[PDB]
Amino acid sequence: NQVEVLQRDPNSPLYSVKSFEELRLKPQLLQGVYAMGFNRPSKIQENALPLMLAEPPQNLIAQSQSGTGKTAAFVLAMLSQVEPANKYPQCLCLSPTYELALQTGKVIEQMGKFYPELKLAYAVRGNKLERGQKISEQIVIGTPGTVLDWCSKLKFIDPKKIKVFVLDEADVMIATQGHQDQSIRIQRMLPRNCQMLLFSATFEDSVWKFAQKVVPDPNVIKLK
């Protein structure tokens, strides 16, 4: 089976992709993808990638069972938009667990390896800082409570400067205490043109209702 395009807004590119080369990525970035052993896009990536890299950017709700496929898809989206020159978070990724966060973190670190000045912060339980300091990293990943804390309670992150926002495993996400409202309150904080990207294996009424609050004007896709 293919991807299903369930809602596609205008100005959102209509083409499938069969090579990472036709995505016209930066060389440093493409080498990164190649180095992890991604020599051609996966089924999901065929459509998700064009949608996520289109100019100007488009929000996406994407049903797919989680796996390296979808993650690398959204990891690539994030890296694509990063500007290592500017030393501050530009990309924000929300994992439902500390363990998932570290795991996805590896993927970022892996795929960004040929990015020399790029560094990645973890907004998780454990990592501490003083309130004076803004963080230097350009990509941040963690669990929503701590991310929320970071953004508004601890002044670590200027939310108004985030251009890509990933919300991973949203089913698992809103099944855990307080995460639903944490995520909503983080997204609220981001600017109009920040790119909203949601991923969930399953989409029950609650989850889908949630997803729509979080991701305006979305592209909706589902695999198999």
Binding site: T143, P144, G145, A175, T176, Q177, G178, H179, D181, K213
Partner: protein
């Protein structure tokens, strides 16, 4: 001053229960609309929608695996006691036998209904036994009211105009002592034993009075508040004899400034020794600037910590005392283990209008949202 990561305390959420329909507009006035009888196992919640009395059991429901944590239980069985005017304040006597409801009414003014809690025990009248009329103005708005912890019949009432009265209720309301609005009282708290009364003033001091209202002690406005930026006492909790949590906020009444929670430790041999004032700044992160500032403080002796909740914030934070018992830390909790108020259907923040702690079932914290949802949490230390 110091944060520390607590991985040994969860606020474990229970099912949210709706008690009132969502308001058309966000309530803005100082309110305290939730009460718990730990003696008779009752919760008392008030609003514009009348007064509701629940068996605490009915409100404490745990969600099973599979249960959408974000689901709001539709309604729970309780008694409805219709009220002519909107209640802004509820409070019990210490023996749980008297409930006070502060109403604001455009024709009459503000007035306190006193109920004998035992009445709510019957089927189909349920009249209060005394009425006290505090004021005819928005000035008569009750901003602080606490009953004496050891003296059932006695209660201190604190008005928007900045005046106070101490009252005795038995067969009728007796006004024992008042103080005029020029005094500028902004808050009240009884001493642990109920032997003295603390009042927070517009000038950022706290003055300890005997119930007769004879002045016993003055707690200075901390030295680190520049005249350039004056503060008033917003809320005060008298925790131990020489130990206070005094909340300070902008004197001018500005909402944009977020109030500081301060642990004050007082000397015994005063002359000469100074008082230690330990600032926590904003322990409950302010996200709203529409609502009147109000800090709901509660002391848990067993755990030697305070539960703080703010009108302007969606979170309950903890101010715990270190084992030395001179210093306090704020705790940081796992995202999955916090007490935070829900987001509304309209995508808005819901903020607290009442906080209480039940022991009759773990201890349980309960919050009543500005959205009329009740949010209960087990506490596991």
């Amino acid at each position: 001053i110091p944060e520390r990561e607590m991985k040994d305390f969860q606020f474990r959420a229970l099912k949210k229960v709706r008690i009132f329909d969502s308001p058309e507009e966000l309530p803005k006035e100082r309110s305290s609309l939730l009460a718990v009888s730990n003696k008779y196992g009752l919760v008392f919640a008030g609003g514009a929608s009348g007064l509701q009395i629940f068996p605490t059991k009915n409100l404490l429901i745990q969600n099973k695996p599979g249960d959408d944590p974000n689901k709001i239980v539709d309604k729970v069985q309780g008694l409805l006691v219709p009220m002519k005017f909107p209640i802004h304040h509820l409070a019990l006597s210490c023996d749980n036998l008297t409930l006070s409801a502060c109403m604001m009414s455009s024709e009459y003014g503000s007035i306190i209904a006193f109920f004998d809690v035992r009445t709510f025990s019957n089927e189909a009248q349920k009249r209060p036994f005394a009425y006290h009329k505090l004021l005819k103005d928005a000035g008569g708005m009750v901003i602080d009211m606490k009953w004496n912890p050891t003296v059932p019949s006695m209660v201190a009432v604190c008005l928007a105009d900045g005046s106070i009265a101490v009252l005795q209720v038995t067969e009728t309301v007796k006004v024992c002592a008042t103080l005029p609005s020029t005094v500028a009282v902004t808050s009240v708290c009884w001493s642990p034993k109920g032997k003295q009364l603390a009042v927070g003033k517009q000038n950022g001091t706290v003055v300890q009075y005997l119930p007769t209202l004879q002045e016993k002690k003055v707690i200075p406005c901390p030295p680190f508040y520049e005249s350039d930026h004056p503060v008033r006492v917003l809320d005060v909790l008298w925790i131990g004899t020489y130990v206070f949590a005094i909340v300070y906020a902008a004197a001018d009444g500005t909402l944009e400034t977020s109030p500081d929670v301060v642990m004050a430790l007082l000397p015994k041999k005063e002359e000469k020794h100074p008082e230690i004032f330990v600032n926590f700044m904003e322990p409950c992160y302010g996200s709203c600037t529409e609502r009147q500032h109000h800090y709901y403080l509660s002391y848990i002796e067993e755990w030697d910590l305070v539960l703080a909740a703010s009108a302007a914030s969606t979170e309950v934070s903890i101010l715990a005392r270190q084992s030395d018992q001179i210093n306090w830390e704020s705790w940081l909790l796992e995202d999955s283990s916090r007490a935070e108020l829900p987001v509304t259907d309209k995508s808005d923040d819901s903020l607290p209008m009442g906080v209480v702690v039940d022991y009759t079932n773990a201890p349980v914290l309960m919050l009543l949202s500005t959205d009329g949802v009740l949010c209960p949490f087990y506490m596991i230390n």
